[PDB]
Symmetry: D2
Subunit: 221 residues, 4 copies
């Protein structure tokens, strides 16, 4: 998925209700360890009886029925950026949260020593700096890492606010060692929803954290 050409990046200043992007990235992510599914709603999601602040039932929509049946009877670890508005999990659940992807096998995936990852960060075409992020998994979802990056960038250089952004465009690029690199745009469409926007994590793309690489590109104005 070679890189976006300028015109291909969503312009933050046309976005309406941009704060709903901020709330996803400024808050805490959903994280659970050594859990196993207890039901599913469609054939391509799995439902977990886990709890966090604001929820006690968590649904994740994966790539298709084959990925879901895969993880269904497996103890896994989860790390997702959740939403509530338009989250659908069970007719009787009043405190549910939803994510896409963020699923990995627990058995064996744990790192005693946490791998630190360099985040090369560019602005208006020049590298302005970098920062490290850390993960405890040998094989991590690209989602878990895109979040740690945006959370840091939000609180350190105001990537998102409860309001307008400073940057016009932005995307994060995951350059695996092995195949095709791939990117995510930091801004949604003018009129969007948190659930449609997060579909970027639905592919459950997981990648070797010792070998991969992370680049971020932003523009001002």
């Amino acid at each position: 998925q070679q890189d976006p050409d300028p015109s291909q990046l969503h312009r933050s200043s046309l976005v309406k209700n941009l704060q709903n992007i901020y709330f996803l990235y400024e808050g805490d992510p959903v994280t659970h360890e050594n859990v196993k599914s207890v039901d599913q709603l469609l054939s391509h999601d799995l439902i977990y009886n886990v709890s966090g602040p604001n929820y006690d039932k968590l649904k994740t929509e994966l790539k298709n029925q084959e990925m879901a049946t895969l993880f269904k009877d497996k103890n896994v670890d989860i790390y997702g950026v959740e939403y509530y508005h338009l989250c659908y999990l069970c007719e009787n659940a009043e405190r549910s949260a939803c994510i896409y992807g963020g699923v990995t096998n627990h058995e064996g995936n744990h790192l005693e020593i946490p791998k630190k990852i360099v985040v090369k960060v560019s602005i208006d075409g020049i590298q302005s700096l970098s920062f490290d992020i850390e993960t405890n998994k040998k094989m991590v979802t690209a989602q878990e890492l895109d979040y740690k990056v945006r959370k840091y960038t939000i609180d350190n250089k105001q990537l998102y606010t409860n309001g307008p952004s400073k940057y016009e465009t932005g995307y994060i690029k995951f350059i695996p060692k092995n195949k095709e690199s791939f990117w995510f745009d930091f801004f949604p469409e003018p009129e969007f929803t948190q659930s449609k926007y997060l579909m970027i994590y639905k592919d459950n793309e997981t990648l070797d954290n010792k070998t991969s690489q992370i680049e971020v590109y932003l523009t001002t104005k």
Copy 2:
């Protein structure tokens, strides 16, 4: 409103998902001072551009169009028990909260010193102890008084928990000076939703707090 015949109270051991009542009275209420509505969905509701931890638009459903148009353009104070599940306010709002009633005119309703109200509590027929709640309004909603009552007994007598209750039945009774006593059952029907249950606050019933009385009847059954 004749007091509950015993076969008229809801049995807690029959409630599915009773923990959803717990979250309502254990968490903080929604409060705003001297605010004005900015819109409405239906004729009997009012929408406020106000914020709290998980929302930034708040809707109150009042008794009928009459009552909503009565407060529509007034500066009011809001004291309410809010819900998110099944809360509908606007097609574009992704961070909404909803309540029933809880509205009092702001201007001239403030007490300079809080008024204590004695709350008598009975368990299996015996007067077991009294505690006080407080309010800053001369005219307060039964709702504000009911929430403070239930918050205090959830954290001190374990009225509710994330799971079953010590108690089989319970209700709170208001005895106004000027008129008819009324009461609210502390447990919903077996299969309920928080929005349906909170409708006890829809009529926006308000009391003179200097002269109101509160009694609570709980059974251990």
Copy 3:
């Protein structure tokens, strides 16, 4: 009930999307004979696996838990005014229909030949129209008779159109023999929902069709 003051009646000229009331009463009602409930979502409702043009699951919301368990294991006949928008039944049902009340015991309730009931229509204080409706039930819901009456004047006197009504106010008055008269206002509040408006049927009010009388009062403009 006390007959309505003109100030109590809703002015149709104030209604937004009045055409939503038209579709309810121009369309076929939902009817089924000798059936029994198979489930329920909440305690005040009953679900029937019965079919019509556009649905294969039908939910009826009754007065309270008491009334729903009263009819839960009985063979009943159903006669309702249904809606789709905001109809909630089951997470797995994509073709649902919803009504309020309209439920009657089937055993012994059928009449050999239809019982005709006269409907007196006053327009602006002058009663120069009479028409009949008929039912196959000895104890019929007000709902059934009311649909009957509104369907007839929608097509005969243009009570409703896909647009405004030539009538400003209008209401139907049921007059039982033995007990209390009561009425339904033909127009809803300015901004409403079909689900909200149809609650006039939730109490499942049933009467003797041999003896009950019907009057309708409309005002032009």
Copy 4:
């Protein structure tokens, strides 16, 4: 669409509620000629003030923001398989219908005489039948042609029933003179929703009806 691998096809006998695919193709399609969008909910959709039975507001979801804006101000023709369950268009619309794609420019896309297209059907490896479908458009969406192929095989060869299908697997393959051939699975995943399934039409794929071929492949258990 690389032609399907036998393991890539969805087996109809695993599907829960296959009748919900049946009602989409046995029912009439939504068709409108020379209409112009009027609004939009999200950037990738367009809403049309058009009617049909059961609806008076129609929404189509296209590929993305660029596609909605391409047709936004255009007079277009619409031909789509509509759904109601989980269709959202507006907070005030109680009668809406939704589709994916199905949009073609109106201007000079019409044909004096319907183009007749021969449909090649194979069943378990042998081509046992050919029938004709027809379109009035020069450039027609694949959606429109699939609808006609399917309405035909439902009514004549039992492709779908209010119950299971006579076929275990099924797909339709489109072969455009020029570029890449593509195909659609006649069957959904086991637990599905109509809304998710119909996304096979979201990309609004369109082809020249004079030079595109339709081929149908079915297997029995």
